[PDB]
């Protein structure tokens, strides 16, 4: 079994930049190598077959290069929609191994999140639990810090985060933080804050509500 290595494993570049992804087979594999692009929540898509030839309908800005043990996918000028993870596959000698993949994300200008908070629903409160959601919308870069406060007390351990993948049009991210505590504990306190740290924000921003309004 031939071990395909891709490098880099992740990468950040701007629109119009030149991107170079390297796939290395640990024994000669002629020109039997293939390039696939995987956008999120969608199926892989063949880009470069035969290590250099282009699948029909595939933008000419994608190019393949190499034979033997070293291969390259090159995107000449990056674009918003090129956000994906890129996989090489040797089709030469079975088992048919895949590279571990290269995550390509688009660099863009700083955007600060729009922060929103949602108290738990009356409906859920009945059921016994209280989920408070904080939403950070459409920000770059991905790195962001969400702190929950309950009456100015820093929370730890009672929350979960989820990040959307990068938006293929405007290259931004959205995040949702969900604080989950029991109706018992939820009703012991008044001020529910969500404090958000981001690069695009001059200082941390807090969104809060008083239980009862």
């Amino acid at each position: 079994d031939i071990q395909m290595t891709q490098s880099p494993s992740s990468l950040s570049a701007s629109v119009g930049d030149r991107v170079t992804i390297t796939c290395r087979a640990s024994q000669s594999i002629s020109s039997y190598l293939n390039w696939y692009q995987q956008k999120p929540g969608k199926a892989p898509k063949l880009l470069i077959y035969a290590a250099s030839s282009l699948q029909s309908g595939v933008p000419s800005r994608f190019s393949g290069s190499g034979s033997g043990t070293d291969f390259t996918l090159t995107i000449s000028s990056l674009q918003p929609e090129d956000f994906a993870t890129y996989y090489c596959q040797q089709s030469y000698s079975t088992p048919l191994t895949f590279g571990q993949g290269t995550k390509v994300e688009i660099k863009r200008t700083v955007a600060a999140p729009s922060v929103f908070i949602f108290p738990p629903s009356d409906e859920q409160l009945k059921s016994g639990t209280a989920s408070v959601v904080c939403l950070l919308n459409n920000f770059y870069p991905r790195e962001a810090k969400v702190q929950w406060k309950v009456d100015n007390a820093l929370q730890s351990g009672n929350s979960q985060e989820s990040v959307t993948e990068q938006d293929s049009k405007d290259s931004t991210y959205s995040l949702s933080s969900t604080l989950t505590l029991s109706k018992a504990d939820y009703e012991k306190h008044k001020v529910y804050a969500c404090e958000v740290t981001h690069q695009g924000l001059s200082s941390p921003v807090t969104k809060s509500f008083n239980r009862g309004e």
């Binding site: 293939n34 892989p44 996989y87 729009s114 949602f118 859920q124 989920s131 969900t178």
Partner: protein, 221 residues
């Protein structure tokens, strides 16, 4: 169009068994080789199995050899993966994919089907509204959504107004709670002026448990 449609994936037991079918159309199946490729969640692509056009030869990945069996019924246009002795490491979206030339290149892929190897119970989700309000408004835009809490297994699809609302939508990836159940949120940002004029209804479908919730989301002040 050239096409591949997976079916039959879903929740299954450890040491259990499951069969995967792939409804091919748009070209003549008899003509080329065929493949199954799996992707464990948040991980890379792994080739499972390949089979020639007649049925001639079948090849398998090591880790599945002796447990998995690939087969094609050209007469009804379908590809199979018989999965036996399912382990946790077999949990993955399994992709149906058509080969091309002597390249061994796969030139068309289906949209996959989730296989989950778990003893845990099926459980439909509860859909709570995420009401818009002034704490949910910032300059003519108002955010709102639905909380799709405590469900198993993946996935849930969420639409808005049957499909009429697609813009500004952000259906988040699911997160596995400590309770062993998944939870997700879908939110949407709309104009604030439409809040008492336009209805907003999230449409949640959790097929593995057969659940179909439509929740109306109404303003808070």
């Amino acid at each position: 169009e050239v096409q591949l449609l997976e079916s039959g994936g879903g929740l299954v037991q450890p040491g259990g068994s499951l069969r995967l079918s792939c409804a091919a159309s748009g070209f003549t199946f008899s003509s080329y080789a065929m493949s199954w490729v799996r992707q464990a969640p948040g991980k890379g692509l792994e080739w499972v199995s390949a089979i020639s056009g007649s049925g001639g030869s079948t090849y398998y990945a090591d880790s599945v050899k002796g447990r998995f069996t690939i087969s094609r019924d050209n007469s009804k246009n379908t590809l199979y993966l018989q999965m036996n002795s399912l382990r946790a490491e077999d949990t993955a979206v399994y992709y149906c994919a058509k080969y091309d030339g002597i390249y061994g290149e796969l030139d068309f892929w289906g949209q996959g089907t989730l296989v989950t190897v778990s003893s845990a119970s099926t459980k439909g989700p509860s859909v709570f509204p995420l009401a818009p309000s002034s704490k949910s408004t910032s300059g003519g835009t108002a955010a709102l959504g639905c909380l799709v809490k405590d469900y198993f297994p993946e996935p849930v699809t969420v639409s808005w107004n049957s499909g009429a609302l697609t813009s500004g939508v952000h259906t988040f990836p699911a997160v596995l709670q400590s309770s062993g159940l998944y939870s997700l949120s879908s939110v949407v940002t709309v104009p604030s002026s439409s809040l008492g004029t336009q209805t907003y209804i999230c449409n949640v479908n959790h097929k593995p448990s057969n659940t179909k919730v439509d929740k109306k989301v109404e303003p808070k002040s």
